[PDB]
Amino acid sequence: PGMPAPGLPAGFERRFSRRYAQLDDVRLHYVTGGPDDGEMVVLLHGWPQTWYTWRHVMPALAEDGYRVVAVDYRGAGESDKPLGGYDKASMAGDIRALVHQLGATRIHLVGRSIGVMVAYAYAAQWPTEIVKLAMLDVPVPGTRIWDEAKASADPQIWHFGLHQQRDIAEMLIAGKERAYILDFYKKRTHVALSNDDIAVYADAYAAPGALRAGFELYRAFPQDETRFKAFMKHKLPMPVLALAGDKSNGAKELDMARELALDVRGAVAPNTGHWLPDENPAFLTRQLLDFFRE
Amino acid sequence: PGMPAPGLPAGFERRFSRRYAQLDDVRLHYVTGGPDDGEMVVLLHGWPQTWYTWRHVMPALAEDGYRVVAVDYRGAGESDKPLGGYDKASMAGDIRALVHQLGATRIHLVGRSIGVMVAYAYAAQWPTEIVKLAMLDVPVPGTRIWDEAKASADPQIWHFGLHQQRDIAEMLIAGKERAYILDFYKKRTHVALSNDDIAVYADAYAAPGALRAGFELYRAFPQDETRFKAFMKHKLPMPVLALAGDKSNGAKELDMARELALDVRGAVAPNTGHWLPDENPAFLTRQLLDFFR
Amino acid sequence: PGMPAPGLPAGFERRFSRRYAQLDDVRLHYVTGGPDDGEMVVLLHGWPQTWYTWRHVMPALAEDGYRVVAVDYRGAGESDKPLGGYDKASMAGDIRALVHQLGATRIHLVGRSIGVMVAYAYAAQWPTEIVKLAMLDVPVPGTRIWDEAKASADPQIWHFGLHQQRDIAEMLIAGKERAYILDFYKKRTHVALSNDDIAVYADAYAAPGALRAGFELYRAFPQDETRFKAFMKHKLPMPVLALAGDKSNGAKELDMARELALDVRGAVAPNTGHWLPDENPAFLTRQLLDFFR
Amino acid sequence: PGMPAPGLPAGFERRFSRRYAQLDDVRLHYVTGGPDDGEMVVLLHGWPQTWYTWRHVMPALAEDGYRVVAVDYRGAGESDKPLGGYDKASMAGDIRALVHQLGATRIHLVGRSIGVMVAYAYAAQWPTEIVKLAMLDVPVPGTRIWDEAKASADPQIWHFGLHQQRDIAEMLIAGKERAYILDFYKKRTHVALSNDDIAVYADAYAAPGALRAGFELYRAFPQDETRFKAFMKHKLPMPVLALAGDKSNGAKELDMARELALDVRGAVAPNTGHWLPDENPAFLTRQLLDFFRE
Amino acid sequence: PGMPAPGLPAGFERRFSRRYAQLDDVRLHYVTGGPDDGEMVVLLHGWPQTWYTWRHVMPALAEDGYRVVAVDYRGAGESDKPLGGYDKASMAGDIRALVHQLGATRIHLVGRSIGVMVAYAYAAQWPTEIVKLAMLDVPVPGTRIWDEAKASADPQIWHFGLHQQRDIAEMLIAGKERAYILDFYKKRTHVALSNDDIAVYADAYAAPGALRAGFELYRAFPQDETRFKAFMKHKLPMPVLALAGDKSNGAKELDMARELALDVRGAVAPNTGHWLPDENPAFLTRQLLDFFR
Amino acid sequence: PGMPAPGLPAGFERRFSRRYAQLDDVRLHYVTGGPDDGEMVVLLHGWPQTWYTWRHVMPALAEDGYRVVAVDYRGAGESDKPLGGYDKASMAGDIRALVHQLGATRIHLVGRSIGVMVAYAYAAQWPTEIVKLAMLDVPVPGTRIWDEAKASADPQIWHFGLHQQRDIAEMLIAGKERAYILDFYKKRTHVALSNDDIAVYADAYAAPGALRAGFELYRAFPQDETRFKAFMKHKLPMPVLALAGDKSNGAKELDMARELALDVRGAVAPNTGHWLPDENPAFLTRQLLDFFR
């Protein structure tokens, strides 16, 4: 019992930091904490999110010794918004480059929504470099669950069409990001969240270029589908964990992951909606720790 | 006494929780706190309000062991905004289905403004399920006080006309929810309230569809008048308490309740306007807790 | 057969002129034509209108030798927008001062909507100076037809409440005058009108102060009610004509007028809604010419 | 050759009239011309259109002795915008009540977009009352052409999702009706049209309630699918003509119609996009007169 | 003598047609007239322009038997606005694909501003296919005239910096296209132009995506610089004409062209600023007809 | 290390004060703290900043007994926005007149961006009055580094062109100061800063006339180039310290200072971008305090 408590968890400010990494043309923003020599855990948000969605998971990961890296991927948050490169395979290259610049070679990888597609493209292109992979909330293109949501005309993906209308989507939503994003979020949540927390996301997507860059993730879905379907001719060898809330995709995250990897295990969060990190960070943190422990 | 203190009362975060209930068509948002096994007290806000109007009534209420369920009814606050179902009788059915969901099956009902019409419609359709009922601040359709406000062209119900203009009302007020709602509120209050508290209501009604959903409550008034007139031909058997501020509807809130229910008692709040839960919670809780003994 | 033809009728531009009259504080705008020596016919528009509503009536009146004066009353159109003076009795004084300044003293008087209240106040205060009075479309305050629309909560006066909200009405409608007024007009019309014609009205009410000044006509209704009830203790002695469309107030214009005058005759416009000069000017000009002859 | 010529054709003003029909609670606006005693031809526009889309077709129909009735259906143009009644079967009832008020019982019926769904529901519910039916540009719900566009996630129906979002669609598009509708239109045309003509439609949809009422046609699609599938158990007996542009649906209007009626004939307009009355009224006028003489 | 006459020249409407060409991903809009069998002349506008800038040149070309094709290149006017492909070499590929789709393969080519960069990239990549090339008003990247404007910080390219700011440029200029573009045009003109003509351009750049697509032409300049410097290791073999107004770049169009081609001839337009087709179409058509003959 | 901490440092309220100084034309706003009798340290911000950029440098500075005077120069922050005087030399004269007002007559000067041009112009015109001088972050006009940024078309000075467009820059950015300034800032930083701190700058430049006044600083650049070139023919006699972040101008801030002054020393701040007082105050104060021994 208790009303929603907005903001970063107590003491977060003291341990975690905001940092920037210059890559070949693109600058990525990320939040990193924990011991510098520890096993690196890279966390990838989705749409419409930033690194901030991991605010309640990052402390616990770091309190078990890991080197936490929460990335604003290309086009999101405080990261640069280049013209293109929003297909998920190339965005995985951005994350790999960041990781290499931070001195690492093998990483644990957690992604949700758009971020779990980037994470999969990371594991598919450089499988030796991903020790363990955690897949949250959303199916990846190329899977059967994905093709079904599309062929059924699933009401939950009504926005795929709109987001893929270049310039039109931006013209409609500019100036109404808070109203559009708060409604998008609340229709898919089950645990009550604080408006001040969701407004952190909405305000990021109101910054110049943030709407456009976010929508280009959706505009690359056809290219991602063709690319990911080729990726799925070699199932992943590393251990994979699949999680989703019972009031949204649930079990279908584990069904989806088993089309992509040989070593799969999964759980469904009780009384939890689409935003696992926002709604049920305790369940998520534990599952990641039990999963990341040998 | 001193200046208005905005926000939830101290310690409120710790004791209450926000929850959702999925019904067939609609998902309803509600706030609860206190022991689970206790007698349930259902609170129904009005226009232009949310559950937040009971912020000073719910703590004390469930410090005495009551199960407090403060509901955003269909279309308000964080609840869904469906196409229809905005007649007050069907809205009562939504509240019953949520009550049934929570495991209860008989409760104590308190309502003001639109909520008191829902609260009455609840008691009228399922008399057995309402232990008691507290009518606050506003008369219900079908009563004489309601019909006399209409015949008087009472200055206070000036907004009935505008709110009943579909699309026109939304077009005029969209983007001006704060200015419209703060003025609507301050013109009907007597105790000075904080802008920050009124802005909580205004911001909810600025949300997508919230203007339309609230205005459809007014667009259903003719249907409610016919329906409530049928309900009042069977006077309520339960004890009923009527309260209103002396600067607004005063004692005709009591007179209105006598038209509907047999076992009625009432009081008039001193130096308080239209918004009893906001203006004088102290008088109100104290009145509620005694009534609830 | 035919699509609506917007604008002034052919030849209007060469026969009529826009003019201003400076009174002691207020400058009034008016359009005039016909012989300088002819019997003067004063035409008073209402809300949301200007002199332009008489555009299809004025040529025929001028061809029959009448001196046509279509006035933008205080606060409307191109006239000044003073702070006050929007009670109808004082606005009749404005029209009388302009009439005296043009060298006339006895006049034929035609009014609709707000203008028929001004026109009645003119006739009640100076009955010897009004030769004949024609009353269109809307009842005047103080009559039982007026009180009956109010007590019934007639849907067609929903806007009384909103317009009487000082500052709120202006804030809601500023910048949306075209949408608000076009909708107001079409919901009450029966003959299809051209949007370009109604926008001439809407554009006038978008000019600085025009919204405020027009709503002050509505904010003065209680004072008009008290003032007109005293006027109605003495029925009007001059001949009176009552007209309205069969699809709007119809015969109630004649019922309303018989409480106001001893010598009343009336007719109902066929296939006509609320805007007699806009919808059926052919019927209106014929009835006026026969009445004034 | 020639540049686009905007507006009504010469002489239109003296030959047609704007009229209203009061139904039991809703008022409908329509434009009518031609002989009072002639065979009635009812024309039903779609989204985002009004009667004005038939401006180049109504003169030729009326000069051949037909009584033309181009209707703004419920919620569109100058018609009333009630709360409900936006399922296509009920909207056909509105059209029938207005035809009956004009003294007619037998009509030729032409529809496109949403109007062809109303026109089909008219013929399905009162088949004896429809002499001939012409179906333009768009498939109706329940057909497999309709169901295959849905299962493909066909890019040309991207807007079905957005339009079905109550309040979100109105909030995003209010104040941008011109930019939204001009783009919607030009992306589906092949013949160059004048901006002034499309703006006539866009300005109608900027009117109070016109966006909401238009989107409720789309929010009623599930109910239309159930209702229309039942309608197609009994194929239509009257002669049916199917037309579409080769650069849009083309021959699939012809396939779609053959699932609905026994006596079907069709043609495909050359070098024509989605908006047959706007783009190639010469072809359409020729096709309708030949069909109505037959 | 004469005030500026806005719009298309008389008879243009009956002689030319707007058409679309679907390429493999992009649909291009273009205006064409003259004999279907004539030698094809392709005209490429720049920023902030559309095909409409050739309105006073196309009739004379068509009367002399040329097949006129005035193209809205990728991202401009009524053409599609794809995500990328705004480097000038790829945009030349778009124009070539449209030319091949119209049944032609050898063409006369005219370009100004961005279009002269596209036109040069066309000639550099497919020199056998360009019969003659006419270069107007603006230097192309890679030349010393281009580098000299950059190193000098020429005030006339102040906008390069702003247009290369992705998302920032769009946010600043969205909704103010008319003020931004009219000012840009008049500061560089010498002959007075009609505001209605320039607004045809401004209104195009206000349509969805048009601002973004046009600025991507500027954001591709570094890539164009690298690509064109490689192209300039082989001077163009076909005849080249260089033109600019005496009040703008003047003889520097001929200096720039001589770094690009072996066979170059040039002239300077009298009493002409930056917009040769808008300001002095009479001089431009004469020079083009003599060059192509 | 951890997350950015927005606002003034703890205890700041207590130790510093806001004051105004009326000069002949203009009133200047400035912040001060520390002992009155101490050596005065003058701080000059740049674009787009106010005194607030020194919030982490001024405390420590005057904990060592310095007299800290952080000035909003002519046109910035809470200072007046006159018509002219935006060449950097005259702005130095304004700073001197304020220094004279405060009773001092020789001081220590620290400046960045526009302030370092003012600070240099101060030392150039009255060499005797400046004890020492710390140049931060930006090269001054007339130097080679300045001239090479112009010839390179350095991507960082993209805004010189736009800011030099009178009325155009104000029209584009008015109402978009926060989005424009936050982006301008974050693109040039390396240490992550809080939006709340950057918004303080943005809100000042949203004030009436603040956009115009700041942009006139850029519109005077050609005049400053001529004036500073004259000043640099007499190399400065005072000790000069040059600092810049390694991710921005780095060591050419030192190279730039050697062009102007004889006794120069410098350092380059590690892992810091363009905004030394904002990004690494710690390195900066420590560097300043040592230099100031």
Residue numbers in the entry:
A (entry chain E), D (entry chain B): 11 to 304
B (entry chain G), C (entry chain A), E (entry chain A), F (entry chain G): 11 to 303
Q: What do the study's own words say?
A:
Here we report the biochemical and structural characteristics of Cfl1 and Cfl2, two Cif-like epoxide hydrolases from Burkholderia cenocepacia. EHs that belong to the α/β hydrolase superfamily of enzymes utilize an Asp-His-Asp/Glu catalytic triad to open the epoxide ring substrate and release the vicinal diol product. Cfl1 and Cfl2 also appear to utilize a Cif-like His-Tyr epoxide ring-opening pair instead of the classical Tyr-Tyr pair. While Cif and aCif exist as constitutive dimers, our hydrodynamic and structural studies revealed that Cfl1 and Cfl2 exist as octamers and decamers, respectively, by forming rings of dimers.
Cfl1 amino-acid sequence alignment with Cif suggests that Asp123 is responsible for the nucleophilic attack that opens the epoxide ring. To test this hypothesis, we expressed and purified a mutant Cfl1 in which Asp123 was substituted with a serine (Cfl1-D123S). Although hydrolysis of R–SO by the mutant formally crosses the threshold of statistical significance, the low absolute level of hydrolysis measured is unlikely to be catalytically meaningful and is sharply decreased compared to the wild-type hydrolysis of R–SO, consistent with our mechanistic hypothesis. The four epoxides vary in length, number of double bonds, and the position of the epoxide moiety along the hydrocarbon chain. Wild-type Cfl1 showed significantly more activity against these epoxides compared to Cfl1-D123S. To that end, we determined the crystal structure of Cfl1-D123S. Data were obtained to 2.15 ​Å resolution, although the UCLA Diffraction Anisotropy Server reports modest anisotropy (2.2, 2.5, and 2.3 ​Å along a∗, b∗, and c∗, respectively) (Strong et al., 2006). As a result, we refined translation, libration, and screw (TLS) rotation parameters, which created a significant improvement in the Rfree value without overfitting, as judged by Rfree-Rwork. The RMSD of main-chain atoms between wild-type Cfl1 and Cfl1-D123S monomers is 0.2 ​Å. Closer inspection of the mutant enzyme's active site shows that, apart from the D123S substitution, the active site is largely unchanged compared to the wild-type enzyme (inset).
